[PDB]
């Protein structure tokens, strides 16, 4: 009984009052119901919801962070939309408003008077204090950052600060008696409009608010030109040029709920209806996004125009975005701890074997490389978005997903070039030449042809990888038009698929027989090597891999049991012309050319990453000083851990620094078409964030 009634948590009396009106109008029109829980602060509401005593609460970005921590672990389910109907946006701008007359710039605020929306709020605290840090001369913890702020500004109103401990921080506040410097409407200088009033009254010199506040609060535009903006370029521009004069671009306030049984569906149901019925000018009897005269921003932001549903994959960290998320965390760190983390590279391992190899690397990196890890490649990408990881080597298929998530290629895996040169001295600058995606079959099955491969059993490296999937399936899809990929072959092993599907049938999990179809090295049939073993052991009739995979796994080149006797002659390639050729003629018999695997990272990490990786490969690379004496980066024994084992070196992108430029027009077009049939949650997640 999850759709009984949505319990909305309020943090004040008139909030409870408006909520009660909401409740009657919803019943007043036979809509999805809602009940009103009373608390006295955002924190109490987060707690309430966490322990199943409330369902939903709207929070500022700064309290979205708080709410997502343990033990609470809540998540944004719906985002407030701002702007207009023509140009809606799920973000706003933290700005610094001043009076037109003074002549100080943002970098000249020492000894001045500041008005803040509230402690720990996005526009009122996290952004401005983050921006002003270099000027703060804060020695770091354990001295609380507040103390440095109390010394920087001669006096401010920061609602919710400990006036006893940080009295300067509560000085300008206007609250009366116990309501002085309170985190609520009782304090007239609380929130966006309060902080703007704090400035208007002349109490403060600067107000840290959002871009709209000045337009919501001043009707006549003559008064609006009495105010100015401080730009981070230490210039002053009019209040209409916020797009070119802001301290940060930040994610809209959002409705949070539990991550488990939070009644997300019921919640979104109520919201959509509430919005349609009581949205902007839908009915005068009730206004979802309006507050009574002396009130502002009750339940939701006034002048919001609706909500947008937050895709399921997104948690508090993903929602906040890498910039803002790590900026908040940084506020409790010293400038040396922050600089150390900026200098180190956190790799993301996929599965315990990669982590294992990663740690070995870590121990020998002299503080430059550390390790993170997850069980899928998509979870790792997510970690990179959240900043708890920095980099990894990816197949071209995942470079697409990474690129649509904002990530970028930095270096590429360079493989034994087309018999061009010796162990190349200039490997690092040799442009990549791609590798060959092929279809391998057993020599004995003399009947198997490209034309007759449909309906047979298939072995793939994984879903969404270049050679194992995007290229074969793209070819098959371009014939028929069916998005029913699990109907192309009788059975397959295609890790990353639905375990109950026929695409998982041939998979065999780990030695114990667990982790079947898991898209990581624990699955014995995962990857280049695994998809070939899938064929050698006669599980499928065709393995979609690259040609060197066969070379590397036969003729005693792999002394592992399943392969120790495999001869290159026992296998053949399928040509698209319907012919079949020996593996050695792959250049004249392959499905397509695949772009090299590449290391991807956040834009902020590119330069550091490049320097570290170059250095590290000079030590542990192919001709690394410490390889093979100590450690080799590109070795693992046909297991392709972290990097392909046949990597010659990591090479320069030669200007192809975007996924589109790196993957190529045709390939990107190919995957985009494939993706009409189905996209991942990560992909849905990132499209929401990109908007
Ligand atoms: Fe805000
Ligand atoms: Fe690949």
Give short descriptive properties of this protein:
D-Maltodextrin-Binding Protein, domain 2, protein serine/threonine kinase activator activity, osteogenesis, elongated, binds fe (iii) ion, alpha+beta, monomer, glycoprotein, 19% strand, 22 helices, lipopolysaccharide binding, 691 residues, seven-stranded mixed sheet, 4 domains
Protein architecture, described:
The strands form six sheets. Strands 6, 7, 8, 9, 10, 11 and 12 form a seven-stranded mixed sheet that branches. This protein is an alpha+beta fold and 691 residues long. The longest helix has 15 residues. α16 packs across α21. 31% of the residues lie in helices and 19% in strands. A hairpin with a 4-residue loop joins β4 and β5. The protein folds into four domains: 180 residues, D-Maltodextrin-Binding Protein, domain 2, CATH 3.40.190; 159 residues, Periplasmic binding protein-like II (D-Maltodextrin-Binding Protein, domain 2); 192 residues, D-Maltodextrin-Binding Protein, domain 2, CATH 3.40.190.10; 160 residues, Periplasmic binding protein-like II (D-Maltodextrin-Binding Protein, domain 2), CATH 3.40.190. The site of one fe (iii) ion has 6 residues, from α4. One fe (iii) ion (FE) binds next to α4. InterPro entries: Lactotransferrin, Transferrin, Transferrin-like_dom, Transferrin_Fe_BS. Monomer. Found in a complex with LTF, CLU, EPPIN and SEMG1. Found in a complex with MPO and LTF; interacts directly with CP, allows Fe(3+) incorporation into LTF and activation of CP ferroxidase activity. It is an enzyme of class 3 (hydrolase). Pfam families: Transferrin.
